[PDB]
């Protein structure tokens, strides 16, 4: 299994595909998340409760 030469080679070729992707700064990734949340918070019933009127469970 790990005695397998084919398995060791498969593994190495995988870590290759994973080592060679494009990355972005976290600073960046964090902003786009924050952005999304703002863009859609007025659309999100759990974030800001809407009155009995529209909510089906009352």
């Amino acid at each position: 299994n790990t005695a397998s030469i084919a398995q060791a080679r498969k593994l190495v070729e995988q870590l290759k595909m994973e080592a060679n992707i494009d990355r972005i700064k976290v600073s960046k990734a964090a902003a786009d998340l924050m952005a999304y949340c703002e863009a859609h918070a007025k659309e999100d019933p759990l974030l800001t409760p809407v009155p009995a009127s529209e909510n089906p469970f009352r």
Partner: protein
Amino acid sequence: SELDQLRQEAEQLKNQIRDARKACADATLSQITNNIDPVGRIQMRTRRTLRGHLAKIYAMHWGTDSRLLVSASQDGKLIIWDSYTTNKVHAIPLRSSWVMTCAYAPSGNYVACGGLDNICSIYNLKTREGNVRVSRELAGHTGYLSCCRFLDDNQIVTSSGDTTCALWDIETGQQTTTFTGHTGDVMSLSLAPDTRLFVSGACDASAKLWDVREGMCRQTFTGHESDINAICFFPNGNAFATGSDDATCRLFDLRADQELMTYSHDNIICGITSVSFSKSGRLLLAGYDDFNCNVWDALKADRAGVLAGHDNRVSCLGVTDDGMAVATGSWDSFLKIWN
């Protein structure tokens, strides 16, 4: 020795990946979200109580109409509820008692479920004659079915205790693609919103990103210290959240290829069974093994709410596509709808 050569080459490649990631860590999510306003507290209270299952509940799924949901129980049945009325629409005796997961398809035409039988079974809801039968038995896995999600009415994706995930062609029952790479039982999967990628969480404490169509693993996230039991995409396909026996949920960014946040507290010790984001992503809800569901603020990490009306484990939960509601299902035979 060439076997020895490949062992180092994989060791140095993990280092290459470790350094490449640190090189992107120029800032934290917690820094970047420091001045945006809190959420307040989330007044969430039981609305409906879905009464029926005669034993522990293991799993549930909302239909896309944000109204129906399927649930799966130790009692050997699926139950399809209309949550507005609490009326059972269908009750389904399974052929194996050892069911463990279930899924409502997006069209509302089919559900799937499975478990210790190592099979994903597709049930059809309205046939020509108009009654509920097994339309397929997707066999091929060599270990329990842990989770399953439809892409549409003819393809479905499953995860298993055999450490693989798989893609199926329902019309022919063929196992068209096979996703290997995990080294422990796979527990949970989540589909991206485009359905071209999905993520898996496993008992090897690693989660993985997969490409549906090309059949390979694009990315591996780690850092949990224990079984990942649950996984869910952030509503924009660019990150996901995981829950684990380590008593923490985490947020991993896809494009930064790494962990952004831990959600945890010193006085929470039980493991997590289930995770879901609210519609906008701000709220991360987690079902816990101390009988509660927690609402976290995804962006800040502060604990923001509690859902507490179950006398046993919250095994599963779910938010509707319309953001209006949360199901929690429990080892105490009950589902509850909250808002």
